[PDB]
Design a protein around this ligand. Structure first.
Ligand code: NAP
Ligand code: NAP
Ligand code: NAP
Ligand code: NAP
Lengths: 251, 248, 255, 248
């Protein structure tokens, strides 16, 4: 069930983070994987290596998805190599915490150019390059609609748009039968989660944060990776234009 | 590969409909399947058969899930037969079209007794009887909040609550490591769709609503229930996934 | 000098306007110059202060009894409401109960206790309202923030009893629309009422409990019926017409 | 009760369309009003004159809510001229239609600069200028969450972000007892509306989108804003209020 054999995926921000486990978990299902990074080539080459190890194929392309020309070159290079593209997961993203009063122009642009503006043009170049029956996944947050942490407003709205984009994308991308969904991850243990959770030591806060879920454990990249896999399968087809929140009954 | 070998599933109203693909599917993933039903024996037996056919086991147990004592006895029986239950699935439900002005008490109770009360006690009995790390799946609709379909007030509240039950049930049913979600089917092609598609060509135009320009089919949602009841779906919890296909 | 959103000429019915949000939803509608049908089941004397308090600011009220768990008493409630004032414009469904219990402990009787008033009752008040209202009327039904906005443990019956009221108002808007009637719902979130002090359990005096509950709000205070009635008194005005079909959450951006 | 005697408001882009009837409406409720325009000073004059001409004072100030340095001067000058500014309203109109395939770097930075980025910084400056116990309001669309027009992919996000902001801005601005809500207009007859109806024949059949069988007009919205910002509308904080008369 829900394998991706003879399919080729692209996953942005896949050298470290929910993205790496998305790819690896695509590769496991039989997807040939394009492992995008921008600043971590060492862990990109570890994902690519670990995707091949479990019996698939992968390349690592570097590209800054704040630059749109570098996104066209990402998707151009990606089809030039493997033959075709079916699946594109928009995952690259940054967190930002700060009361409204102190949010500067420079901070707002940093966060949106990647989390909102970037994704949009990673989605756009996904469609223009994608086989029919293809797949597009974008990354939102559960702080988008479901949880309202103070001094968190900039990051929140950066993903809210993402929630709104997918719904309309799902319409416009019918004429190639591509389905558009976001996953909205919650407290998933990554460099980004530990960086947030201050608002004691990261293990101490990871231990505590395990309680928010009634399952009484943390969320991990594998947790979210598994959901993209389903939605990016042919078996996930009828989930189209939906935002799946993946926190685990947390609050 | 998210299968359910050596696990045991129960599917209410699994004789005909979306709950007949949610049975077989859980059987194609290699679960043992208790096909529940009420006024349709032949159907549930062709289902219990098809599930045997792909190398799993199944049984037909009849029970009206409008009746809370029958739901007790259904799960009491299920566990008696396969030795344990891992996955409970609330499929059963009726449709109803009528302007607020014309809805009567009989008609209010006819719908709620099964779609809302029924599914609630199915979910009570599933918690009491289920293993740790188990799955309750309940069934709502897209007419719940998404679609404002005229003369559809009664169906919607029945399923609206189902949307609320899973969010709270997820905090409640956690003392046994059980996850709780609903699937909000759209207009999956079944006996119901046809009784309320408003001849054949009714459906032929429904296809064009979804941007994929085809209809929703029972096995299109079964697939979503299968993932949610797998080991891999465990971090989806308290959520009502909407399987509309992009319809509008 | 513009005095907006008055209800002069108009006649309104609030279910469970003896105590809680309905009293202040009836006094306030009263304050805005409307003639008001106070409804109560077991609080008759309370219901009579709320008529007097309404007559006091120079309108007119009556206190009709009816248990809205019983559908024929809903019909009689409304038949009477017109048979006194001569017409009905506004209809407010505030009557409702609370229940804490783990899914596993929730009996048939408790489900029926709650659902029969919180959902079924409200449904038929909404039905008999569309039937008895002047064209251009308003129907407000009450819900909660525990309906979707918040997931409180051992709270499952309530959330779904009031989580059907949210599905209802979006479809009722269209149905009643063939008489130009706006159907919206209010989501009382933490209103300080006998139903709040009941829940503020989940040792500590209720005051102690609400003083603390106040911290929860970014506005650091409690919700009071006064707060909710003010929204109801917009929703129903001539001017609240383009708010149609929506569930308003009136909790204070609280968590 | 419902009045604004003593209060000074601000409304961005309140020369034309809704923001203007939201400027006139607050004037009607006895607020003084900073009108704000970028391109239409002659409209910005008709408003100041109408608001003077029902008892309240008004000034018009220019500002490209795109340039953040211009947002700042606008608010500095508003406190300066009136001595306070309890209310602040956000009206940023740039509709854009197209397919994800034909959307450019340039159109995004045009819509999102005023629709998203502008509104964010109007909201920042509003906070830092406002009398404690004051108000901020933002303008989204029903096409944020409740609808899916095949082509608004960008506009919908340009407002769906606004929808998330208000929910966190309600927590932030609570340390001055300011409430922050977004009104989310449906189809509302303006210059923007006649632009993306794609004559009056395009509007006469829009009159039937709502179950009240008329169109939305600026007043319809202006009145709701008028409540949100009224003293009585306090306990609605951090919300979207979709104002579309129940339109599908
Ligand atoms: N876990 C959570 O709490 C959570 C919650 C909600 C949403 N998310 C979303 O999940 C996604 C990833 O989370 P995470 O846990 O992976 O966080 P993370 O550890 O911070 O991941 C950072 C990822 O972002 C990539 N990145 C940063 N700047 C980039 C640029 N200019 N171009 C391309 N990629 C860039 C990084 O690649 P480099 O290797 O080049 O740095 C890396 O892949 C984000 O999209 C975020 O919005 C996470
Ligand atoms: N099909 C759709 O288009 C659609 C769309 C939206 C929502 N839904 C929801 O999905 C579920 C069913 O859809 P459907 O298409 O499967 O329905 P369907 O084809 O009409 O089938 C009705 C199912 O209900 C069972 N049933 C009815 N009353 C029962 C009772 N007292 N006890 C046990 N079983 C009973 C029937 O089994 P027996 O006759 O064997 O007793 C049959 O399985 C419902 O939950 C409905 O609310 C369906
Ligand atoms: N208060 C909150 O914290 C809160 C939170 C969420 C939702 N709500 C919703 O707000 C609404 C009202 O709450 P509240 O603060 O008023 O609570 P309250 O103090 O419990 O109000 C009780 C009201 O219920 C009426 N009532 C009870 N049984 C009735 C029956 N059979 N028929 C007609 N009326 C009946 C009562 O009148 P009698 O005197 O005749 O009993 C009284 O008006 C409810 O819908 C509730 O779900 C409240
Ligand atoms: N009308 C609708 O149907 C509708 C529907 C949904 C949402 N909305 C939302 O409502 C708002 C406007 O609707 P409308 O019908 O009122 O708009 P409209 O007729 O297009 O009027 C636009 C207003 O935007 C102002 N504006 C444009 N660029 C500006 C800038 N750089 N700086 C300051 N002001 C600027 C204009 O000012 P100048 O022209 O004076 O330069 C004018 O006041 C927008 O927020 C829109 O997203 C409207």
């Amino acid at each position: 069930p829900g394998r991706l054999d003879g399919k080729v995926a692209l996953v942005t921000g896949s050298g470290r983070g929910i993205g790496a486990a998305v790819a690896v978990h695509l590769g496991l299902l039989g997807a040939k994987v394009v492992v995008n990074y921008a600043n971590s080539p060492t862990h990109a080459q570890k994902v690519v290596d670990e995707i091949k190890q479990l019996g698939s194929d992968a390349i690592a392309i570097k590209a800054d998805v704040r630059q749109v020309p570098e996104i066209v070159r990402l998707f151009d290079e990606a089809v030039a190599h493997f033959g075709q593209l079916d699946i594109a997961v928009s995952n690259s993203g940054v967190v930002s915490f700060g009361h409204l009063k102190d949010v500067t122009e420079e901070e707002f642009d940093r966060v949106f150019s990647l989390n909102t503006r970037g994704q949009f043009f990673v989605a756009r170049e996904a469609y223009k390059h994608l086989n029919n029956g293809g797949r597009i996944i974008m990354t939102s947050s559960n702080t988008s609609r479901d949880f309202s942490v103070p001094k968190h407003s900039l990051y929140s709205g950066s993903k809210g748009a993402i929630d709104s984009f997918v719904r309309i994308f799902s319409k416009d991308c019918g004429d190639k039968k591509i389905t558009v969904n976001a996953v909205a991850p919650g407290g998933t243990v990554t460099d980004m989660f530990h960086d947030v959770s201050q608002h004691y030591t990261p293990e101490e806060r990871q231990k505590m944060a395990a309680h928010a879920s009634p399952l009484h454990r943390n969320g991990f990249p594998e947790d979210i990776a598994r959901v993209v896999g389903f939605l990016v399968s042919a078996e996930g087809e009828w989930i189209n234009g939906k935002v799946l929140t993946v926190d685990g009954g947390a609050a």
